[PDB]
Amino acid sequence: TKKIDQSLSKKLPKGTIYDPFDFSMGRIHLDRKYQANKNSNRNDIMKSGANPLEFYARPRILSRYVTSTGRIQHRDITGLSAKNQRRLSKAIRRCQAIGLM
Amino acid sequence: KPPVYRLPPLPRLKVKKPIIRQEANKCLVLMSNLLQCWSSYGHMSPKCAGLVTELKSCTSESALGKRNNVQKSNINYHAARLYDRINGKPHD
Amino acid sequence: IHVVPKLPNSKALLQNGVPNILSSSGFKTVWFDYQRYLCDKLTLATAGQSLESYYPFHILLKTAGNPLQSNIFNLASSIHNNHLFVENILPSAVEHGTNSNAVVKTEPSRLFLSKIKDSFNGSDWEVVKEEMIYRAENEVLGQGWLFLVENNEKKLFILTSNNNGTPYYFPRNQSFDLNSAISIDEFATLKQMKELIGKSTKLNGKVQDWTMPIICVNLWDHAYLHDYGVGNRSKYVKNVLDNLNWSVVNNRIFSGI
Amino acid sequence: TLAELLGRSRIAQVANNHKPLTYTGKKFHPTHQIIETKPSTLYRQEWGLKSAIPSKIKSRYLVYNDLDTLERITTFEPRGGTQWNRLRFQEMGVPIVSNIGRQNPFFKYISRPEDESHAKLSLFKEMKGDTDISPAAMKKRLKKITALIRSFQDEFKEWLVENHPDELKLNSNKLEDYVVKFLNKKLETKTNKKFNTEIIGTGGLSYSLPGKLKNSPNGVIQRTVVPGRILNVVKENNDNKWLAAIGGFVADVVFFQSPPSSFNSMGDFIRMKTFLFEILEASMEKNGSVSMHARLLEPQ
Amino acid sequence: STRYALEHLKEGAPLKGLFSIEGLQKAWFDRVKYLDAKLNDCTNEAQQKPLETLIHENSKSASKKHIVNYASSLYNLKFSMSSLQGCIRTPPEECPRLGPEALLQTPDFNRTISNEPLTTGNERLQAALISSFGSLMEFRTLLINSNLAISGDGFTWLVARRQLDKRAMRNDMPNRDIEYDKLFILNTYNAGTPFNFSTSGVMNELNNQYTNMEKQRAKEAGNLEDSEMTAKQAKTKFIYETQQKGFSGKEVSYIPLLAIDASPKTWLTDYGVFGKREYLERVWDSIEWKIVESRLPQRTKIQ
Amino acid sequence: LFYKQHPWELSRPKILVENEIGDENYDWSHMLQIGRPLDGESVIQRTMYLIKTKQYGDMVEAYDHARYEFYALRMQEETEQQVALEEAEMFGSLFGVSAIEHGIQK
């Protein structure tokens, strides 16, 4: 067979430097273990400094912090500060009461 | 910012059932493929000849092959050895 | 920091040079100036690295196989070679500064003259000196070194190097000048050497060479120009080989006692 | 004093670094200072750090973050492999060239205001170059600056009525120009980001000047041939070039016309084989990466 | 031998600012006399053919190497002293001799410049140097450093690649064939020549003789080739060829424009063991850029 | 600042093991010193000497002046190594494994 699963091969980006270890399975496993959604902050409005309570009439943004059934995600999952989690949950509950979410 | 959770002082640091990787038996997988080969191309089909030949060699002397079927975890040995050093406990 | 070694009877060397070879000015150029020049450059190249704690001979061996450390290798090889040359042309290795000794009559030992006959098909020492002078004039167009070396087979033979070529490690002898044209026989020697270096299994691609120098003559312009001049390097090599310190050269031949 | 000595100590010379020792993102340049110990000191676990490095370590190179921690260990990784990437680049003898034809950053050139005609582009870059700034510290750039700029109102309420009164009575199209120049002229004396942290040129990867030819026993070398590896068996998606792994760098390989048949044959194991490449050019991007372009020299 | 004489080099007179009287004797007069004698003691045609003819006629032969080593050593030395005029700097014999402290001085070749070609009217040479090296500070640094690096005998050349890699009717039109694509710096060692047309391929040619001779001895032995001797010799030959090819074809030649001598013979007498960089600084301030601009071919404006 | 501007200077190994701090007799009028490598610290100490001697007033100006001295020394060393390798190969020096080859094998 001339095919390998993507999970068993690492694609080295262009312009990056590499070591021989980057072709091993240890690199594959190490990349899975340390795979965190750290790029969310730059794409996370609520981790930017905006007040989540100003989005109570924008269900599309709020729908990014609820599960498929509408259950607000725990702070352990959203990664927000206590204040933003508190404000975001209020926004979602207000949005639900208005008839938008 | 990622919340660090610090444990209280503990009587021990131990994993109840340390996970171990049990590599799959080579003879059992050979048998699982041959059985599948017969399911599609038919029993005794000439397409599964190589599978039959390989299975016979794998199982010729031992039905599960000559393998080092022994693997144990050492996490509990190291955890008990290093806990007092790394727990960050205040001085006496 | 690599410092210039102190030489025996240095006050005499700074006043009357080396009798019959170099004058006071000629010796200041070859040793007191050039050796300082080399050691300072070596210190600048190696300071802050692991090589700073190693003697020049060990540095050249450690770096002999590393292409991008050739600059360090050249400096280490030149420093080691220059003190090999200055040591066997020196009036007396012992420091007769307070003994005012003026009688140092050193002559080839029996073991040296026995190995010369064995390795040169019965040729005498005088004839071998003529071959050494000839080899230097026809094989070293510019800077380099002339060596009489001994190999693992107890045979003395003549090796010439271009610029800073070590006698110890044949891959870096630099005995063939590839700027000019080479014969098929010389290309065969180079091709055979390349094959030997490829048979080594070490990850550093290094081979074993047990060749050791016995006599060293500096063929650089820093040693002869001021006293002999352009074109008179064969008169310089003749004087060096006729006024060698044989207490040092004899001690370089392994006896086994 | 002891404080003076400490500031100049070899440990002080290493700049503070808390960057992850285990980083799984894109690496474009070294992030940690390589520490080396001599063989004699390694035999005694001496690295010039606070504590002895565990004897298990056989490498002579490491990178560290903290001398000591609350876990009573040193935070270090026994690797020094970014040095071999730099030395392999040196062996390829390809000078780094500017794709924009900018002045050489390593030479003290006499520059002029040719690019200074964008005073309003960069004077406001100080407040507009805030891509990743706090929502309130960036807002402190609005009141703190407003007061500073508002303190020059009297100076600009007299200079403008003494040097360009016509514009004040005709149009503000030129007044805005006199404003941008005024602040910059009164800011060049000031020190706003007087130290620039941007990478300077190659960043230290290469100090080789373009122009020199490589003499060889077989004549002057006209094309640099370097062994490499093809990573993918299908060109980069959306790009007309494949990717190769040459000397610790990932390059874009352009093929003469066709792709060798070993590609289809090998498939996803193509990286298992070594090919010969020619390094066309090497460029440096602002992210601090090296843009190496290669060519799959195939036996012909 | 007036055949090897320059009008600015007069016995008894010093090249002011670079060589003293004793330093110009040893460097040039006492040196040409030796090289001439050796060239007259190897070939009887020395006083018959031009030096460059001997260099390009007796090349690639191991039996005539001594004719070409002395011939190309005297050519390089003349071509080096030809572009030198002198400087207003203090005479070398009146300045103190640089000592070990010189090795610790920082070179200022990236901050300042002096004696640029354009300042003397050679405007076409300055544009070419800026185009190929980026600037005249880059060129000066890359030229003084390349010569300073040379340990023993050698020359640092300013060359111009000839854009006539076609090989068809080559060397038939003294203008259509004299066209330069780009300028470069090249180092030659001992008696090496900067042309590269009469010596490129030498190792590849000798390598192919060795393999054929070994292959014919193997046939006598009766061997079944080898698993990787046909794939290793092939790779060695494929790399030898791909590294000597030109942009279009494999005829890459170079036109000497300038040459700086690195041999200690030139600078050891006047500047001492520690004064090579001082020598190279005064050499740069002693280059007559008119002679160099004269040698410069006409640009190949294919662009 | 220096290592943020020159990330690849980090790849040059540094030895933290001291020899004898009391022996350091350095004249920072020049950047090169006998006994220590040329590295980022050479730039920092040169910058401090300039500000201490009051040749320059602003730290930035002294730092830039030192940086250019550092570039000049780095360019002379990059050429000495390239040329030394080239010159050795021209006299028949042979090398088993190059850095590029070492990486391929690993």
From Swiss-Prot, chain A:
GO process annotations (BP): mitochondrial translation; translation
Supply one GO CC term from the record. mitochondrion
Disulfide bond positions:
none
Quote the subcellular location field of this record.
Answer: Mitochondrion
Q: What are the entry keywords?
A: Mitochondrion, Ribonucleoprotein, Ribosomal protein, Transit peptide
- Which Gene Ontology MF annotations are present? small ribosomal subunit rRNA binding; structural constituent of ribosome
Remarks, miscellaneous: Present with 1210 molecules/cell in log phase SD medium.
Stated role: Component of the mitochondrial ribosome (mitoribosome), a dedicated translation machinery responsible for the synthesis of mitochondrial genome-encoded proteins, including at least some of the essential transmembrane subunits of the mitochondrial respiratory chain. The mitoribosomes are attached to the mitochondrial inner membrane and translation products are cotranslationally integrated into the membrane.
Protein name as it appears in the record? Small ribosomal subunit protein bS18m
UniProtKB/Swiss-Prot annotation, chain C:
Keyword Mitochondrion present in the record's keywords: the answer is yes
Q: Which GO terms describe its cellular component?
A: cytoplasm; mitochondrial inner membrane; mitochondrial small ribosomal subunit; mitochondrion
- InterPro entries from the xrefs? Mn/Fe_SOD_C, Mn/Fe_SOD_N_sf, SOD_C_sf
GO MF annotation, one: metal ion binding
- Which key words are in the record? Mitochondrion, Ribonucleoprotein, Ribosomal protein
Assembly and partners are described as: Component of the mitochondrial small ribosomal subunit (mt-SSU). Mature yeast 74S mitochondrial ribosomes consist of a small (37S) and a large (54S) subunit. The 37S small subunit contains a 15S ribosomal RNA (15S mt-rRNA) and 34 different proteins. The 54S large subunit contains a 21S rRNA (21S mt-rRNA) and 46 different proteins. mS42 forms a heterodimer with mS43, building a large protuberance adjacent to the mRNA channel exit in the mt-SSU body.
In Swiss-Prot or TrEMBL terms, this protein is called Small ribosomal subunit protein mS42
Taxonomic placement: Eukaryota, Fungi, Dikarya, Ascomycota, Saccharomycotina
Q: Which gene produces this protein?
A: RSM26
UniProtKB/Swiss-Prot annotation, chain D:
Chief location of this protein within or outside the cell: mitochondrion
Please verify whether the record's keywords include Ribosomal protein. yes
One example of the protein's molecular function in GO is: structural constituent of ribosome
Which keywords, in A-to-Z order, does the entry hold? Mitochondrion, Phosphoprotein, Ribonucleoprotein, Ribosomal protein
Q: From the Swiss-Prot or TrEMBL record, state where the protein is found.
A: Mitochondrion
User: Where does it sit, as one GO cellular component term?
Assistant: mitochondrial inner membrane
Q: Check the record and name the Pfam families matching this protein.
A: Mit_ribos_Mrp51
For this entry, list what GO says about its biological process.
mitochondrial translation; mitochondrial translational initiation
Q: What does this protein do?
A: Component of the mitochondrial ribosome (mitoribosome), a dedicated translation machinery responsible for the synthesis of mitochondrial genome-encoded proteins, including at least some of the essential transmembrane subunits of the mitochondrial respiratory chain. The mitoribosomes are attached to the mitochondrial inner membrane and translation products are cotranslationally integrated into the membrane. bS1m functionally interacts with the 5'-UTR of mitochondrial mRNAs.
Assembly, in brief, is: Component of the mitochondrial small ribosomal subunit (mt-SSU). Mature yeast 74S mitochondrial ribosomes consist of a small (37S) and a large (54S) subunit. The 37S small subunit contains a 15S ribosomal RNA (15S mt-rRNA) and 34 different proteins. The 54S large subunit contains a 21S rRNA (21S mt-rRNA) and 46 different proteins.
Family, as annotated: Belongs to the bacterial ribosomal protein bS1 family.
Q: What is noted besides the main data?
A: Present with 656 molecules/cell in log phase SD medium.
Q: Provide the protein name.
A: Small ribosomal subunit protein bS1m
Q: Organism source for this protein?
A: Saccharomyces cerevisiae (strain ATCC 204508 / S288c)
From Swiss-Prot, chain E:
Q: Which GO terms describe its cellular component?
A: cytoplasm; mitochondrial inner membrane; mitochondrial small ribosomal subunit; mitochondrion
Which GO molecular function terms does the record list?
Answer: structural constituent of ribosome
**InterPro entries given in the database record:** SOD_C_sf (IPR036314)
Q: Does the keyword Transmembrane helix apply?
A: no
Q: Which GO terms describe its biological process?
A: mitochondrial translation
Q: Keywords of this protein's UniProt record, alphabetized?
A: Mitochondrion, Ribonucleoprotein, Ribosomal protein, Transit peptide
What the record says about family reads: Belongs to the mitochondrion-specific ribosomal protein mS43 family.
Subunit annotation: Component of the mitochondrial small ribosomal subunit (mt-SSU). Mature yeast 74S mitochondrial ribosomes consist of a small (37S) and a large (54S) subunit. The 37S small subunit contains a 15S ribosomal RNA (15S mt-rRNA) and 34 different proteins. The 54S large subunit contains a 21S rRNA (21S mt-rRNA) and 46 different proteins. mS43 forms a heterodimer with mS42, building a large protuberance adjacent to the mRNA channel exit in the mt-SSU body.
Also noted in the record is: Present with 2840 molecules/cell in log phase SD medium.
State what protein this is by name: Small ribosomal subunit protein mS43
| Taxonomic source organism | Saccharomyces cerevisiae (strain ATCC 204508 / S288c) (Baker's yeast)
**What is the gene called?**
MRP1
